[PDB]
Amino acid sequence: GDLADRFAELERRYDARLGVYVPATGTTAAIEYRADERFAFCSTFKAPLVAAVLHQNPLTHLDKLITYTSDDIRSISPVAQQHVQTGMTIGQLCDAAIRYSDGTAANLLLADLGGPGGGTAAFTGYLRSLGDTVSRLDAEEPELNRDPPGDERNTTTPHAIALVLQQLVLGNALPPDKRALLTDWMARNTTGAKRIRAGFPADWKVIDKTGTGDYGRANDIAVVWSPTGVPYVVAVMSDRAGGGYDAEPREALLAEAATCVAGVLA
Numbered sequence: 001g002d003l004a005d006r007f008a009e010l011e012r013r014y015d016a017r018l019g020v021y022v023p024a025t026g027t028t029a030a031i032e033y034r035a036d037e038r039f040a041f042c043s044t045f046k047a048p049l050v051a052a053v054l055h056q057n058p059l060t061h062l063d064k065l066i067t068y069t070s071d072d073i074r075s076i077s078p079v080a081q082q083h084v085q086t087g088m089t090i091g092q093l094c095d096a097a098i099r100y101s102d103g104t105a106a107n108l109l110l111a112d113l114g115g116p117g118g119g120t121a122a123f124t125g126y127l128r129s130l131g132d133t134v135s136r137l138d139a140e141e142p143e144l145n146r147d148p149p150g151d152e153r154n155t156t157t158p159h160a161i162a163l164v165l166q167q168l169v170l171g172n173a174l175p176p177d178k179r180a181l182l183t184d185w186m187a188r189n190t191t192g193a194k195r196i197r198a199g200f201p202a203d204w205k206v207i208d209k210t211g212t213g214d215y216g217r218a219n220d221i222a223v224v225w226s227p228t229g230v231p232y233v234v235a236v237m238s239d240r241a242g243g244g245y246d247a248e249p250r251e252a253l254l255a256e257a258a259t260c261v262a263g264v265l266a
């Protein structure tokens with residue numbers, strides 16, 4: 001048969017555009033579907049953002065206390081809005097940014113990278129350093145989730161983001177100790193149970209970072225491990241450009257796409 005047909009059938013059924021990339025491995029071919037089309041990052045950028053902060057600092061930096069006010073809560077911040085009085089360490093912010101997709105935490109981590117545009121230029125530079133000539137981040141939370149479909153700002157490609165995550169989690173872009181921190185935060189993500197996780201059998205490990213936004217945007221990037229401990233990177237991205245800015249994102253589309261991918265990999 002042809003996996004591409006079955007992805008196209010998902011697009012028809014969900015009235016959505018779907019993007020998939022699984023890098024080839026020692027024993028498997030790549031899986032690609034619209035893998036070089038652009039899709040908005042949404043909150044999926046927070047995994048490589050945490051990697052950028054890790055990369056650029058000794059681990060003692062994770063204890064640096066960042067202070068902020070209620071006026072800094074400008075996006076959905078489940079953790080940060082309950083710590084305005086005490087503030088949050090860079091480590092706590094990393095934790096929140098990944099595991100709770102904390103917007104304010106992401107904005108504070110961007111500010112930590114520093115430079116023009118509140119850290120957005122710095123973030124894009126980190127991606128360039130990892131060989132990503134495609135992806136760009138141009139806005140903070142929450143604006144980065146809400147560009148129209150035709151806007152290249154704040155976009156990546158399944159192919160590009162997959163190769164970034166491969167390096168970070170399974171490669172040598174980070175030293176082992178920084179890598180383990182990123183891996184753990186993603187492994188204990190709380191937002192992802194209905195996406196790639198829901199497409200893989202329960203004896204597979206899944207670590208992930210979700211993203212959600214306007215025009216029906218639903219993304220998930222994961223690293224999965226087979227029951228024998230063989231790893232693969234899975235990037236799935238979707239949107240519904242024809243359904244209006246308020247089109248409903250479809251978690252089940254990512255879960256079904258992931259099921260298709262598990263069938264190939266198992």
Ligand SMILES: *C(=O)/C=C/N[C@@H](C(=O)O)C(C)(C)S(=O)O
Nearest residue numbers: 042043142145210211212213214
């Ligand atoms: C991260 O992926 C997304 C954060 N926020 C978005 C979401 O759908 O959760 C929005 C579009 C609501 S954000 O307020 O722009």
